[PDB]
Amino acid sequence: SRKLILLIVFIALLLDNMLLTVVVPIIPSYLYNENVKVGLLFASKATVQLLTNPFIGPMTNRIGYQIPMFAGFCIMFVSTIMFAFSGTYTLLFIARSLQGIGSSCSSVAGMGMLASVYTDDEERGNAMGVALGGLAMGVLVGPPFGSILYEFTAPFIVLAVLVLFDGALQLFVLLTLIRDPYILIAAGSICFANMAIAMLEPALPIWMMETMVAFLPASISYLLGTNIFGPLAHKMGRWLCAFIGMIMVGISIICVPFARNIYGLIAPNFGVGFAIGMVDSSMMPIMGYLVDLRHVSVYGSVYAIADVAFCMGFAFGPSAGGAIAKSWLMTIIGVVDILFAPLCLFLR
């Protein structure tokens, strides 16, 4: 009976990630400082998520999480269809903002409900690793499915008919500020670990073009690592797992950029994806453990902070891409990550 909530969270996360990733190959200018607006097109979702999550945080504790879940389903259902008839780019920006706030609400409600239903550490870790694996599956299957169905209304009909079953199942089933660094360390670690891939995402096509599917190895590694290295981390402490993951991602990021040939350039992305997935999966339940240590037993605000840290990198990663490219390696994030790694060496 308890696995129904996990299934609902899985479906919601997969749906949100699939909707997010389908926008990558198709652009409003493609279908017909322009690149600045193109970047803003996908930056708007992250910015509105960051702006909206903290305000909708405490409402979960004030009222509940099932009603926010139903509202997230409703807003997703009313927002997805609008992509079918798009007139102007500003309408696309508005649709992106609505989808972003809906995804934020759905994710926070799902994480809160999943944290509240299970009070056991290893089961909680397994459930959240399953959620992360579902996110990985969605981000992996988005682009190819969208690309193949673009040729064979048509681009989004499958999603429009898929949301219906999830909505029907969901319908049928029915202190703000912290000065403690013990959560801030995890927030910063996950923020930088996500900022690494956020910065790596747009820079690679520049090298590909100047040297004459890029994120597929990374997604494959993420999916094949998260679910397989999640549960085993409970056997021992979180020190070694997080430290090794941070060291691995730092080494991979430092070694990836320079490449004499491009055929083997995709191989380091496997290491990057494995490292980011391992770090995220290992670090996710530590916040819940700290909440259990804390007097407050409501996980809504801490998971809201976690999501804010998750989306901080997506907010303005590619904002300074051209300036960084014009600007000794162009990427130095690995050094920052490795020097910040020993901060989380000691844990309760």
Author numbering: 18 to 49, 125 to 244, 248 to 269, 285 to 322, 331 to 445, 450 to 470
What text comes from the article?
Vesicular monoamine transporter 2 (VMAT2) is responsible for H+-dependent uptake of monoamine neurotransmitters, e.g. dopamine (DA) and serotonin (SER), from the cytoplasm to presynaptic vesicles in monoaminergic neurons. Vesicular monoamine transporter 2 (VMAT2) belongs to the major facilitator superfamily (MFS), and mediates cytoplasmic monoamine packaging into presynaptic vesicles. Substrates bind to MFS transporters between N-domain and C-domain, and are transported by a rocker-switch alternating access mechanism. In this work, we report two cryo-EM structures of VMAT2, with VMAT2 from Xenopus laevis adopting a canonical MFS fold and an engineered VMAT2 from Ovis aries adopting a non-canonical fold.
Eventually, the structure of XlVMAT2WT was determined at 4.0 Å resolution after extensive data collection and processing. A total of 348 out of 514 residues were traced in the XlVMAT2WT structure, including all 12 TM helices and several connecting loops. Intriguingly, comparison to the hMCT2 structure revealed that the XlVMAT2WT structure adopts a canonical MFS fold. Unlike OaVMAT2TM8/9-BRIL, N- and C-domains of XlVMAT2WT are structurally similar, and could be superimposed with a Cα RMSD of 2.5 Å. The XlVMAT2WT structure was solved in an apo, lumen-facing open conformation with a large, deep cavity. Serotonin was placed in a pocket between TM5, TM7, TM8, TM10 and TM11 near the center of XlVMAT2WT. Meanwhile, the hydroxyl group of serotonin forms a hydrogen bond with the side chain of E311 (TM7), and its amine group interacts with side chains of N304 (TM7) and D398 (TM10) via a hydrogen bond and a salt bridge, respectively. Meanwhile, purified XlVMAT2WT showed reasonable binding affinities for substrates dopamine (Kd = 1.13 ± 0.52 μM) and serotonin (Kd = 0.43 ± 0.22 μM), and for the inhibitor reserpine (Kd = 17.0 ± 8.8 nM). The non-canonical structure of OaVMAT2TM8/9-BRIL forms a dimer, whereas the canonical structure of XlVMAT2WT is a monomer.
